[PDB]
Amino acid sequence: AXXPAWX
Amino acid sequence: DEDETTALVCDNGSGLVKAGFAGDDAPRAVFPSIVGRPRHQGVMVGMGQKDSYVGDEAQSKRGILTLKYPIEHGIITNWDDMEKIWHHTFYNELRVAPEEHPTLLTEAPLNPKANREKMTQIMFETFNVPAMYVAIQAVLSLYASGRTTGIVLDSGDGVTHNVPIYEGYALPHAIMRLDLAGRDLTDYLMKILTERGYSFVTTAEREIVRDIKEKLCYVALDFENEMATAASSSSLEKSYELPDGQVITIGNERFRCPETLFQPSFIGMESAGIHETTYNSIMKCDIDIRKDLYANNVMSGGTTMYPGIADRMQKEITALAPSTMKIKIIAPPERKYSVWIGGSILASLSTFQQMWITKQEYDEAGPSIVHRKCF
Amino acid sequence: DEDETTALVCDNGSGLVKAGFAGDDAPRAVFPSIVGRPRHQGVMVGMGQKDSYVGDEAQSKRGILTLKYPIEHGIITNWDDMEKIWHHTFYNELRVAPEEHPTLLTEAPLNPKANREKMTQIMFETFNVPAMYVAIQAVLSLYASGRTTGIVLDSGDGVTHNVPIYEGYALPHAIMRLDLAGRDLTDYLMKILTERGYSFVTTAEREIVRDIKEKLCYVALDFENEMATAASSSSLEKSYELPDGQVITIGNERFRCPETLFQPSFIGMESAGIHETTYNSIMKCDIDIRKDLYANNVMSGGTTMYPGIADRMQKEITALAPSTMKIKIIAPPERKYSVWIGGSILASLSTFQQMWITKQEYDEAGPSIVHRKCF
Amino acid sequence: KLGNIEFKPESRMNGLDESKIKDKNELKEICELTSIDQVVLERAFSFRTVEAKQEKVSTTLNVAQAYYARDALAKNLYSRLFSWLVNRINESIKAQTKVRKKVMGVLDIYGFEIFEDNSFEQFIINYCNEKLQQIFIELTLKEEQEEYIREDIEWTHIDYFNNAIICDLIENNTNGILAMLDEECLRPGTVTDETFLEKLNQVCATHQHFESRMSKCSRFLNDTTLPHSCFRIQHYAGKVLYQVEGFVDKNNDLLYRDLSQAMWKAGHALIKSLFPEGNPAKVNLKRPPTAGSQFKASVATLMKNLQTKNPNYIRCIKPNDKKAAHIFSESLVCHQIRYLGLLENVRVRRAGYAFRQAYEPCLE
Ligand SMILES: Nc1ncnc2c1ncn2[C@@H]1O[C@H](COP(=O)(O)OP(=O)(O)O)[C@@H](O)[C@H]1O
Ligand SMILES: Nc1ncnc2c1ncn2[C@@H]1O[C@H](COP(=O)(O)OP(=O)(O)O)[C@@H](O)[C@H]1O
Ligand SMILES: [Mg+2]
Ligand SMILES: [Mg+2]
């Protein structure tokens, strides 16, 4: 979750 | 409205306003102590869209706001924003005029005295209250217990207390203050959630992480075997659906968050922990007080609704205190509210109505009257 | 004439002028944004035969004209021809004086600022408007929806938008712009019609192909099984009588034309597609915005009257967005006009009448006033 | 019988949701009654057409917009039957062979309908009282002043409380109360009345006479006599407290082009004669004026039919509500003396005079 890249 | 002169009991610890009337079970208004403010431009013309959102409305709009807590570690940092919080408290939520009601504010021990003094100046000068009184928050947390003997831990959003009291007499040399509380646990949980893979950095995402901490955290009675228990299998993993979509699954972060409360080295804070500041507050008391503090160890504010923190608490204070002592951790499930509830008791006492700092005594002695009438 | 000072709402996206008055249902004048010009010599003496044909008259004479669009990908390329288009707009079609009416122009986000600036210079210097205002076109497309929260796709003749807005606040970092739109689909359809056997190369034949695209194209919810459906039988073939004689019969070209909109590799354009630029515009917004963008996904300009593009649109955004999200594609059948209709709403608002860039403020601050008053 | 039509939602198509009538018996009997095709009027409640240039594309109303079109068709049909009725009374006694004529008129207009729970209607009532006192303070007081100064006597009488400030409070095209209600019915988004009062608190409440509780610079903040969802207006007579409930629901006059276009074919030579806007050869493309436009334009029509004339006033007083011929209640009449502005009238008429004449009939 988050990001793009993060989950 | 209110057909009487019932006293207001307003209780902003550092992260949650809970206000209401005296002689009352629960606080009438409980809302976040935030003031939100738009960080990009308004485009729909004819919208309203005021340039300040206080309280629960700010969490209704937190995707387009920068949320900002006006009170940090029990110290009011923004004074105009705290005046927004108080203005919203009296006039919008509790929906009453402060001119008609004496008000009971709370703060922590060992605070800057300009917090207490400027809080009195804002109550009389701005809101024109007839009377006003600051109150030590853990003391009121013992008023809700129905006890006059006990040591009180509460641990709100910015401060934790340990005020010991014996037979009605507080022991102000044996008082404590640690600035490790639930907003620090929220920040540490947000860090170790970044360790798992989930990046929360915005103030609104900080509010999401705070929700994960409230819903989905416990305290781990034995931290090492719980740690290896989470390392062995996935029976401690638990999923949380974030707002708007993606689900997360947290493991050892579920109990590493309040272990910081029992072990402040995790957030890099040199301290003794909650369990040792209680025992050190008891050992600073006299010899003939201590078993009446052991059997009356009240544990009654916010950030104590972690499941098992009374079990960890008794289990660790018993290891510090001598044997043949009866360690009773009082954790009354109405806590998170018992500072307000004891405020309601104290403001509804009949002996107390000459202890209000009144106007024409504020006007006579300036704002420093709080350091001779309050405590 | 017009007995009041009603604001003009002129909306040239890139391929169709739709202009009218504020406080009005539909645009009064809708005509092609072309200027035609004779490419061989006049022989009947005593004819008139002016050496410029603007608007609908150019399509009445397109067999002897070279049609030329003065506005390409939302950028005005010919300025004297756009002045022909505006002159014909005010004085011939809408049949009014620009000196008496404030005018509301529209353009796309992420445009060259000399387009907006020279458009303001031409409105005040040439047509002498009293007030003027450029407006972001998808924002106005959300004004027509009656919503202040939603992400807007419109896709006119030269540009597509995806402007996300939450609670009246736009998210200009989450804004999008793709230069794939209906004139590109017209050119691609003209290419694959050359693949079937029908050669269209003239600008007038380009206008015929555009008519084939409007009458006789849909979007194919599942492109592979629709493709094999057209490969199996001739149940998807459909005939179109060309002007002056010969009939044509198109098959898979009926749905390969707007599949380029969902898959821009067909026209050799490196992009993500319409459905992924919506989802990427939503994911660039904050976490607490996204389900209110999922349930309010307005799809409201031209080139969206392909049958089933809301079904393909929801069917593909649902595959991108997480489950337990409510994907609502708003496709209000009054679109192709809703940028104008929201222009009519915004110009008829009473809060808006101090947001007009007025003359004596244009004369005070030059033509760069648009970058402090407009957006 | 048009009021029994109630609507229910319907999901397809996805955006926006269709309003669908529930029981078609009342609609079937009013379509049998007025002799209109039933599915034309049935589509005139749920759908409105937009029509740019030779296209007839039909879009969908909300359920709330369907009750607004239902009620707007009702009250426009009734108000327009009333206007046709007055016009038909007019064309029996008409000034045939029209010449330069002179008029003596009688205006049966209300007084200050100040009710315990005021609404949008009593707001328009008190407003046209504000314009009415403006046609006293403009016409009569300023002809006193041009007369008094013109006849060589040295006065400029002491002061008057002008009402241009209150008209500026309500009929201003940008800062008015009616203009922010026209905004409120043109705003995208949730258009409830508390957002209207919030808008009045925002930019309307920099005003001396607009008195609200939660306004911006609120001097009336600590007052329990002001409740929420209310606002006072200090008129020239006194303060009138307005409930905002139903305010934005009763601004709405969404008589769409398809309602008049449906009822133009509807049977009678009356309902067809009521709506010339329903002619497809009469392309009236403008949006429907709601109620500040309509009632404010009707006040402006009244002021057009009074500024050319001399006014002479009747101030009419009831003693009690029980219709008694002997009983004279003091409190109700003191209410009416306070809000008909009579002591201020006595103060103004004590300026210098009570009588004026020319020389020659006075000497005669
Ligand atoms: N059910 C819960 N479980 C764990 N933590 C909680 C729970 N409820 C509240 N908290 C934490 O307690 C803090 C608020 O407690 P409270 O004593 O009301 O704060 P304040 O100091 O503002 O009075 C917040 O930081 C919140 O994260
Ligand atoms: N019914 C239709 N089906 C498919 N495409 C259409 C239809 N009507 C118009 N278009 C295309 O939409 C484009 C014009 O849309 P519009 O939003 O009016 O353009 P503009 O950018 O000029 O406002 C043209 O390219 C036209 O080919
Ligand atoms: Mg607390
Ligand atoms: Mg367009």
How would you sum up this structure in a few lines?
This is part of a larger assembly, with 1 copy of chain A (7 residues), 2 copies of chain B (375 residues) and 1 copy of chain D (364 residues). Chain A is low in regular secondary structure.
Structural notes for this entry:
The structure is cut from a larger assembly and holds 1 copy of chain A (7 residues), 2 copies of chain B (375 residues) and 1 copy of chain D (364 residues). Helix content of chain A is 0%, strand content 0%. Chain A has no helix or strand. By secondary structure, chain B is of the alpha/beta class. Chain B contains 14 helices and 17 strands. In chain B, the strands form 5 sheets. A 6-stranded mixed sheet of chain B has the order 3-2-1-8-9-17, with helices on both faces. Chain B has a 5-stranded mixed sheet with strand order 12-11-10-15-16, with helices on both faces. In chain B, α5 packs across α6 and α9 crosses α11. The termini of chain D are far apart. Chains C and D meet through β2, β3, β16 and α12 of C and β4 and α6 of D. Bound molecules: adenosine-5'-diphosphate (ADP) (2 copies) and magnesium ion (MG) (2 copies). The PDB classes it as structural protein. Keywords: Mechanochemistry, Mechanobiology, Structural Biology, Cytoskeleton, Molecular Motor, Myosin-I, structural protein. High-Resolution Cryo-EM Structures of Actin-bound Myosin States Reveal the Mechanism of Myosin Force Sensing.
Supply the number of helical segments of chain B.
14
Strand content of chain A: under 5%
Number of strands of chain A: 0
Q: Could you say what the CATH architecture of the largest domain in chain B is? A: 2-Layer Sandwich
The first-level CATH class name of the largest domain in chain B: Alpha Beta
Function (chain D): Motor protein that may participate in process critical to neuronal development and function such as cell migration, neurite outgrowth and vesicular transport.
Protein name (chain D): Unconventional myosin-Ib
GO molecular function, one term (chain D): actin filament binding
Keywords (chain D): Actin-binding, ATP-binding, Calmodulin-binding, Isopeptide bond, Motor protein, Myosin, Nucleotide-binding, Phosphoprotein, Repeat, Ubl conjugation
